[PDB]
């Protein structure tokens, strides 16, 4: 019902691109869903392949995704990417 949402520090450069592209509002709406139910079928939530690795994605918009995994044991969401354009 509640999760800790963290981000790999090597992924924080994505957040600056999210900010400069005026997508911070859409990104933290995803963060709020990740805090409550990271499996809620909203924001085009998808289970990435191969599904045994249990990586997930949510759409910040049509181009960019939040890619993350979930530690169901300790109830913690690890954001691994918040920018889906090759830079």
């Amino acid at each position: 019902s509640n999760y800790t949402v963290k981000i790999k520090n090597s992924a924080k450069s994505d957040l600056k691109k999210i900010k400069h592209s005026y997508l911070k509002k859409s990104f933290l709406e995803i963060v709020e869903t990740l805090k409550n139910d990271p499996y809620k079928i909203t924001q085009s939530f998808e289970k990435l392949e191969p599904k045994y690795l249990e990586r997930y994605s949510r759409r910040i918009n049509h181009q960019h995704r939040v890619v993350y995994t979930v530690d169901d044991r300790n109830k913690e969401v690890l954001i691994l990417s918040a920018w889906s354009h090759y830079d």
Partner: protein, 85 residues
């Protein structure tokens, strides 16, 4: 792995669409030519694949796999100061 000819796929087509969604198991169509070789997949199963291919083709999954492996630690998302960005 279900392999069937184009003729038998066409005959059972309506049931194949049901089985591919119920079993979540793709159906391989293999005929005498390369132009008639194809795969039928349920739409929701396809969307997971489609989304993954997009993240692979943009190089995002490479950076995801890199960052999973590195030793950079994790900052809590509430601790991020967007003004120091």
């Amino acid at each position: 792995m279900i392999i069937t000819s184009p003729t038998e796929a066409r005959k059972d087509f309506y049931q194949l669409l049901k089985n591919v969604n119920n079993n979540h198991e793709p159906i391989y169509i293999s005929g005498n030519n390369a132009e008639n070789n194809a795969v039928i997949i349920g739409l929701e199963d396809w969307k997971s694949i489609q989304e993954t291919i997009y993240l692979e083709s943009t190089g995002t999954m490479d950076k995801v796999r890199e960052r999973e492996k590195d030793n950079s630690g994790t900052t809590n998302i509430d601790d991020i100061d967007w003004d120091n960005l």
